[PDB]
């Protein structure tokens, strides 16, 4: 008799589970959950004992545009007010390190305008704005069709990306950084892998992978910044499997395939080296998945800004070197922290008896604090002292006694970011 009662329980839970799938796979529900779950995923992987802080500011993309369009100028925007005004530009305050926006961007004119304003804000207070790109940006339904794209470079030639192309040429583009594919936040509910109380719920992910609780990769990149700072108080170590751009402990999900078993890739796709490199060329930050593991890595953090080409001369190539350093976030983070230290420490000095050469003497002694100019500093120790060389010149603002014009130029240690190899068999080689 009980066997029939158990069958009634089977059918009851079957019906209840069919309904629960609808709520759990609701786009409104997932938007709320993924926001807070991804937030904690960030928060609990930081260390607040290492002088790391985070604030939440509830804002939709629509109202960001509302505020920035409403305001006569960016300096009077609401966002500017408590990024710049209440922080970097306040005596006794503190500057915002970076801004993480939980948004997906398309090629839409509204999205491009929003990026323009965020680039301006980030430039004024020397902090990068990081977010994500939507699948449709590449003219595909989801990121699962990235393998089908034959050539991204040619794809971006279309008139559809006219505004995006102009955006990459702006001097403000250095403070924008967009990430590519999302990543899993939650393993689907299961009696064994992820059980719930009472109700025997077995989540049923359909053919649509959108049923999976995908998360904004921008958070994963934000944890990279936090770790580098927690260890060194600098944020350059964010671009390597070993350097500290590795994302460890990704959710896994083994399920039946064509009679075999396979795991849902933590990222929508398994990005190849060639496809990653293509994305890097188009100024995207692609979180690649390490095949057959639960680890992903950020091979590089290029900004949106497109590098400029110069004449192939000694001076022209030097210009290219300097401009390319500017285009990469791993080096801009150094300048950002330097800008924050100068603003603070210099305000303390206002009113002191300083002549021109007094500034050169003191500024030189100060900058040396972050220089490691040894023959061969311990690898990744260079990390706490990011600079190799630096030069300071101070001049006088003529017809304005007490005011000075200072120039600070720095030569950071270089990140290993690619190489070409030529193999050759040879007889009579020098031993």
């Amino acid at each position: 008799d009980k066997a029939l009662v158990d069958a009634m329980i089977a059918e009851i839970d079957k019906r209840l589970s069919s309904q629960v799938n609808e709520i759990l796979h609701a786009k409104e529900f997932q938007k709320l959950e993924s926001s807070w779950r991804s937030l904690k995923f960030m928060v609990d992987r930081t260390d607040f004992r290492e002088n790391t802080r985070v604030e939440m500011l509830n804002a939709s993309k629509e109202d960001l545009q509302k505020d920035f369009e409403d305001a006569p100028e960016v300096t009077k925007s609401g966002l500017y007010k408590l990024v710049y005004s209440n922080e970097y530009g306040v005596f006794g305050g503190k500057p915002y390190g970076i801004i993480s926006a939980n948004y997906d961007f398309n090629v839409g004119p509204q999205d491009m305008e929003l990026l323009r304003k965020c680039a301006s804000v980030a430039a004024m207070a020397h902090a990068p704005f990081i977010g994500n790109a939507a699948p449709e940006v590449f003219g595909e339904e989801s990121f699962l069709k990235l393998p089908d794209l034959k050539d991204l470079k040619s794809l971006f030639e279309g008139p559809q990306y006219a505004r995006w192309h102009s955006f990459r040429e702006s001097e403000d583009a250095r403070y924008v950084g967009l990430a590519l594919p999302r990543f899993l936040l939650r393993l689907p509910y299961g009696e064994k892998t992820v059980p719930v109380k009472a109700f025997n719920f077995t989540e049923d992910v359909v053919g649509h992978h959108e049923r999976y609780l995908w998360g904004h990769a921008s958070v994963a990149l934000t944890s990279r910044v936090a770790d580098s700072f927690a260890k060194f108080r600098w944020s350059p170590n964010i671009i390597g499997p070993q350097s500290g751009g590795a994302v460890e402990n990704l959710p896994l999900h083994q399920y039946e395939a064509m009679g075999e078993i396979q795991t849902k890739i933590p990222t929508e796709v398994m990005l190849t080296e060639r496809r990653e490199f293509e994305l890097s060329e188009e100024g995207f930050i692609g979180l690649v998945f390490r095949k057959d593991s639960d680890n992903a890595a950020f091979f590089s953090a290029n900004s949106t800004q497109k590098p400029r080409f110069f004449g192939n001369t000694p001076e022209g190539k030097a210009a290219e070197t300097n401009y390319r350093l500017g285009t990469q976030l791993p080096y801009m983070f150094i300048m950002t922290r330097l800008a924050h230290y100068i603003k603070v420490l210099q305000r303390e000095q206002i009113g002191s008896w300083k002549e021109k050469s007094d500034l050169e003497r003191e500024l030189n002694h100060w900058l040396s604090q972050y220089i490691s100019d040894m023959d061969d500093p311990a690898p990744a120790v260079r990390s706490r002292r990011p600079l190799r060389a630096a030069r300071v010149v101070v001049e006088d603002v003529e017809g304005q006694p007490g005011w000075y014009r200072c120039s600070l130029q720095v030569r950071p240690h270089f990140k290993y970011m690619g190489a070409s190899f030529t193999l050759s068999l040879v007889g009579k080689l020098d031993k």
């Binding site: 709520i23 709320l32 779950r37 802080r53 985070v54 939709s60 925007s77 390190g97 993480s100």
Partner: protein, 135 residues
């Protein structure tokens, strides 16, 4: 100088009337994350396809509330959805009966309590009563 990040995003189910310059930032850390969610007050008013019946025109509107991340679990979703909560109460009634943990008189008394909820559809009550063993 600390390393402070600003996480900007749509953390609520709706836009605020308060101007951007007026709404304030919230400091979050490991020792108050849940407290922040509770104070933020989360709510979702949304409609999903009603798959508790066989009607394409049947829709279910829910009003979920969250205080912590634990409130996104299917267990809390059921508790805040009467149309599922009553089915879970039914589940518990039938498992108790089938494991012989209560007699027929208690079973019938509890059954009537479950199905008494005026927010239930009569179609759902019928599907629930159809799960009762004849004995």
């Amino acid at each position: 100088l600390p390393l402070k990040v600003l996480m900007l995003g749509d953390f609520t189910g709706q836009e605020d009337a308060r101007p951007l310059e007026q709404r304030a930032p919230i400091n979050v850390d490991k020792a108050n994350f849940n407290e922040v969610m509770a104070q933020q007050n989360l709510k979702v008013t949304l409609t999903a396809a009603d798959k508790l019946s066989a009607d394409p025109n049947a829709t279910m509107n829910v009003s979920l509330q969250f205080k912590n991340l634990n409130d996104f679990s299917p267990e809390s979703v059921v508790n805040q959805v009467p149309e599922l909560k009553k089915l879970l109460e039914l589940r518990s009634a039938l498992n108790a009966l089938k494991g012989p943990l209560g007699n027929l008189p208690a079973f019938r008394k509890k059954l009537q309590a479950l199905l008494a909820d005026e927010d239930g559809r009569k179609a759902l009550i019928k599907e629930l009563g159809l799960t009762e063993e004849t004995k």
